[PDB]
Structure 1
Amino acid sequence: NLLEQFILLAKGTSGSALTALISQVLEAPGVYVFGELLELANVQELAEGANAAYLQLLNLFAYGTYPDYIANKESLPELSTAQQNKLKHLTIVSLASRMKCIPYSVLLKDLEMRNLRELEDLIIEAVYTDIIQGKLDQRNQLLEVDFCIGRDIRKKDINNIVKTLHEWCDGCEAVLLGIEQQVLRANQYKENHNRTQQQVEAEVTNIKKTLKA
């Protein structure tokens, strides 16, 4: 993949060339999840020195959304239009991850946009890049997403993932239990009916045995 193609050059280099490489990665199309790039020790070693801003920018791209690049706009270096478009696409993906019907006003507020047409064009190009799949609806000012790619996961949120899966498992188990109970009752009911019918039959034929004298 693209990350594999851009990852082997980051071993031997460090310093300005490394930061230029991460900038090129952030500019290259197709790359949207920066998991293995941040996992390298060379990237993490940038915290000490004069290149902490690039590390903060990479962390913001990996996990943060567009408003996070509002309070600390002056701290990070200038961004080109490709990086801004990629960040907006990541913010759209993050928003669609939570709710499946994104209102237009929420998107306009979140992406800091002034025109509805520009927002629709940005959503259209995001769909063309094939990061999310969905359809717009101007009558209700809604965007419906049927499937969105998961974003990056840090090594502290995994426990929460477990919780959700656990919940699902529990629910399945509950359903199973109910199933059993229901079918059992059904069977019993049927048996009861048959039994009583048989009893009646016995009675009447017994009557016959005592009436044909």
Structure 2
Amino acid sequence: TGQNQEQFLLLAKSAKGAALATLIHQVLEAPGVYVFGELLDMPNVRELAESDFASTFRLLTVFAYGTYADYLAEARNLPPLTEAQKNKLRHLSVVTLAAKVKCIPYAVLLEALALRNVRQLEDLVIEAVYADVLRGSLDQRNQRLEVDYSIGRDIQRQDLSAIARTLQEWCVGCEVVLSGIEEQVSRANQHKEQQLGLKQQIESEVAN
């Protein structure tokens, strides 16, 4: 998303209670809008929390942080969604699965998205790749989804540290590899010169 961010933020700053409550149902039922981080952090939408339209804010929280199974567990409280919105939330659940692991079996996908047959799932993954949400390829025989690239959904202000926790884990990793080379290169010289020196001793005994 990018154009829709500005286009709906313009309307978000110029909207009130009920108009915002219906705007939430309009942003979730719109193609391309898979991130709601700027929209959920608005004071105008913060007013809707713990108010007359609380379930809509909870629905936006599920769409920005939770999965389709989390929606199914709280479907009695949350407002009803159409097939397009249910699909979108399923796409985002596949993104969460893809964020966890690279190779996703069909069983875990069928259980997490609440699907009955394989083609439904395959068609949803196609709809994902076609909406530029996921990249990858499907394997029928081994019944597995090979994920090449998945987008970012969750913002997580409190759990942000975890990102750094992995980034540092990569940094340290680099810092090992780098030093490794520095040492190995040094060794590669340490041998060479030594050997040359040794040869120069052998060659000095030819005169005797």
* Mapping of residues 29-178 of structure 1, within 5 Å: 29-178=31-180
2:13 alignment partner AA:
K
Whole-Å Cα distance in 2 between the matches of residues 194 and 102 of structure 1?
Answer: 56
Between 158-167 and 194-203, report the one with greater CA deviation: 194-203
User: What secondary structure does 2:203 align onto?
Assistant: helix
**Percent identity, aligned pairs only?**
60
Work out the CA distance in 1 between the residues paired with 2:50 and 2:74.
19
TM-score (normalised: structure 1): 0.93
Note the aligned Cα RMSD (angstroms): 1.1
Say which SS state the counterpart of residue 141 (structure 2) adopts: coil
> Which residue identity does 2:90 align to in structure 1?
K
**1:152 Cα deviation from its structure 2 partner:** 2.3
User: 1:197 and 1:89 mapped to 2: Cα distance?
Assistant: 68
1:192 equivalent in structure 2:
194
Instruction: Give the equivalent residue in structure 2 for 1:183.
Output: 185
1:48 positional shift: 3.1
CA deviation vs aligned residue, 1:44-78 (integer Å, no higher than 9, x gap): 11113211101000000000001101221110111
Q: Determine the C-alpha separation between the residues in 2 that align with 1:52 and 1:17.
A: 14
- Alpha-carbon distance between aligned partners in 1 of 2:100 and 2:118, rounded to the nearest angstrom: 22
The one-letter code matched in structure 2 to 1:166 is Q
Q: What amino acid maps onto 1:136 in structure 2? A: L
CA-CA distance at 1:201 after TM superposition = 2.0
Q: Which runs of 5+ in 1 are unaligned?
A: 208-213
Q: 2:51, 2:37 → 1: CA distance?
A: 22
How far apart, in 2, do the equivalents of 1:170 and 1:69 lie?
39
Partner residue, 2:16: 14
Q: Rg bigger for which structure?
A: 1
Q: Match of 2:136, SS?
A: strand
Q: For 1:54 and 1:121, how far apart are their aligned partners in 2?
A: 28
2-structure distance, mates of 1:113, 1:91: 13
Letter aligned with residue 127 of structure 1 = V
Q: Deviations over 1:114-149 (max 9, x none)?
A: 111211111111111111011111100011011111
Aligned residues: 206
Aligned AA for 1:63? Y
Q: Secondary structure at the match of 2:147?
A: strand
Q: Distance in 2 between matches of 1:126 and 1:93?
A: 9
Tell me how far 1:20 sits from its aligned partner. 0.7
